[PDB]
Homo-oligomer: A and B are copies of this chain.
Amino acid sequence: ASQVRQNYHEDCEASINKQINMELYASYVYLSMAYYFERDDVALPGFAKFFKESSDEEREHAQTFMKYQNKRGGRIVLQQIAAPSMREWGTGLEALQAALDLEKQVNQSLLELHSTASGNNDPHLTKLLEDEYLEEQVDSIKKIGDMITKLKRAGPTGLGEYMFDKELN
């Protein structure tokens, strides 16, 4: 047992190790899209840069959990990073409809770790989730909301996606 650990139950320590994989796995889906939107027969540069940023953002969430793991006394245990269930994503809107759910799923879990953190009387963990993750998830689920509403009003297909791209970019 590390020299720096107190009021850190080991249950929470293990779900930090499951967020980091969920955080890791997500950033690996956002990267598949960005570069799918970089394909010649796709040629959506504005979704590409959006998801590459999503790729980078999610990768930082994971790292900021891994430093917290080292910041309470717990140990990092890095499982695999599986493959996104898909290669091709189709329209930019379909891309967005999936990112929304993954974000909810990630918000699902960030909300659950918080109540796991809460049964253990860990007000230092609840805080972490609470200025570094719980607001960035909900700004970001609201962000795709708007975006989807803008693209379907934009006319989800054809000239609407090409124009929506330019404003995204």
A contacts, CB < 8 Å to B: 2-4, 6-7, 24, 28, 31-32, 35-36, 38-43, 45, 63, 66-67, 69-73, 75-84, 87, 100, 104, 107-108, 111, 114-115, 118, 121, 123-124, 126-127, 129-131, 134-135, 138-139, 141-142, 144-150, 153-155, 157-164, 166-167
The 25 sampled A-B contact pairs (Cβ below 8 Å) are A2-B145, A3-B145, A3-B149, A4-B138, A4-B145, A6-B138, A6-B141, A7-B108, A28-B81, A32-B78, A35-B67, A39-B70, A40-B70, A43-B153, A45-B146, A73-B145, A78-B83, A79-B83, A81-B82, A114-B121, A115-B121, A124-B134, A127-B131, A159-B159, A162-B163
Main DSSP-derived SS at the A contact region? helix
Q: How far is the CA of A126 from the CA of B135 in the complex (A)?
A: 11
Contact flag A40-B6 (CB < 8 Å), given A79-B83, A83-B81: no
**Contact A2:B134 (CB < 8 A) given known A7-B111, A67-B35, A76-B87:** no
